[PDB]
Paper text:
The crystal structure of insulin grown in the presence of serotonin and Zn2+ revealed a T3R3 hexamer (referred to here as InsSerT3R3), with six neurotransmitters and two Zn2+ ions per hexamer. The hexamer quaternary structure is indeed T3R3 as the B1-B3 N termini acquire here a more R-like (fully α-helical) fold rather than an Rf, “frayed,” conformation observed in T3Rf3 oligomers. Coordination of both Zn2+ ions is tetrahedral regardless of the R or T protein environment with axial Cl− ligands. Serotonin occupies six sites in InsSerT3R3: three phenol “main” sites I and three hexamer surface sites III. It is tethered into site I via (typical for phenolic ligands) HBs of its OH group to -CO of CysA6 (range of 2.41–2.43 Å) and to -NH of CysA11 (2.93–3.17 Å); a weaker HB -OH contact to -CO of SerA9 (3.38–3.41 Å) further stabilizes this phenolic anchor. A significant HisB5-Nϵ2·π pyrrole HB (3.46–3.56 Å) contributes to the immobilization of the serotonin indole ring, which is assisted further by more subtle van der Waals (hydrophobic) interactions, especially with LeuB17 (3.45–3.59 Å). The -NζH amino group of this side chain is hydrogen-bonded to Oϵ1 of GluB21 (2.55–2.75 Å) and -CO of CysA11 (2.72–2.79 Å). In contrast to site I, the serotonin-binding mode to site III is rather dynamic, indicating its mobility on the InsSerT3R3 surface. Although serotonin is pincered there in a hydrophobic clamp of TyrA14 (π·π interactions ∼3.5 Å) and the side chain of LeuA13 (from a symmetry related dimer), the ligands' electron density is generally less well defined there. The firmness of serotonin-site I interactions, which is propagated likely toward the N termini of the B-helix, combined also with a very good overall fit of serotonin into site I may be behind the induction of the R (i.e. not Rf) conformation of the T3R3 hexamer.
Author numbering:
A (entry chain D), G (entry chain D), I (entry chain D): 1 to 28
B (entry chain C), H (entry chain C), J (entry chain C): 1 to 21
C (entry chain B), E (entry chain B), K (entry chain B): 4 to 29
D (entry chain A), F (entry chain A), L (entry chain A): 2 to 21
């Protein structure tokens, strides 16, 4: 969950771009 | 469980799209 | 400073990333 | 949020209102 | 949204990063 | 690319055209 | 190749800044 | 093999510059 | 110190946002 | 030693604030 | 290109991140 | 720095002047 936190930073950035106007949810 | 799925293997774009609203 | 596009999501992750959050533009 | 924070300015504390 | 400078490279890495890509501004 | 995507807009799918 | 993917995100960002107008190539 | 070289040790700037065009 | 370098990239970005007008210092 | 403290556990915001000027 | 806000800090980390640095806006 | 690099332009080499 430290390598994962960092990875979380990358995921929400990927989701920002993938989802666009729909937006997303993020939740460990 | 996006952390569980996608910080384990390299998820695809269609995979990341399941967390879109 | 103005938090826009990708930087707003990064700011959201700095504050809520342990506890999750929702990002809904409209 | 994109008005609260992109258009107008916002703190990191105001952002805490958007968490789960 | 407009993908400019560093964010265009990040968008390129989201799509092509498994398979590589070229970034040539001019 | 910087016209396709910075100047004009582009999708992530249009970006798939630039990969190897 | 998951820690590396994340690392790849950092590298192309470093190359964006290092190369400038010349640009770069990235390829695993 | 930039992943191989530069996700192993901390590459230098001159090292990263070999992948410029 | 490679996983840490990457982590350093995340920290100075977190500090950029946390500190604001005061600014920060970063030092391994 | 921010690398030592904060690349080990998930530091808090108040924790990261000790490195503000 | 212009290095502003978060991107200036990232540029600083690309150059000084091994050896540390200070970021002081004013 | 934010004048040297945001307002006016700067290199990565000019940035080396800000390190420790
Ligand atoms: N198909 C790779 C897309 C992608 C971009 N960034 C990512 C981060 C984590 C992940 O599992 C996947 C990704
Ligand atoms: N000399 C460190 C430059 C640098 C910045 N970001 C990096 C990421 C990976 C790497 O191997 C090197 C770097
Ligand atoms: N409380 C989590 C804040 C945070 C955001 N990014 C981080 C990176 C490293 C760290 O130790 C902590 C953080
Ligand atoms: Cl990382
Ligand atoms: Cl920007
Ligand atoms: Zn990272
Ligand atoms: Zn930006």
């Amino acid at each position: 969950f430290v390598n994962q936190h960092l990875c979380g930073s990358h995921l929400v950035e990927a989701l920002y771009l993938v989802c666009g106007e729909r937006g997303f949810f993020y939740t460990p | 469980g996006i952390v569980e799925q996608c910080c384990t293997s390299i998820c695809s774009l269609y995979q990341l799209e399941n967390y879109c609203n």
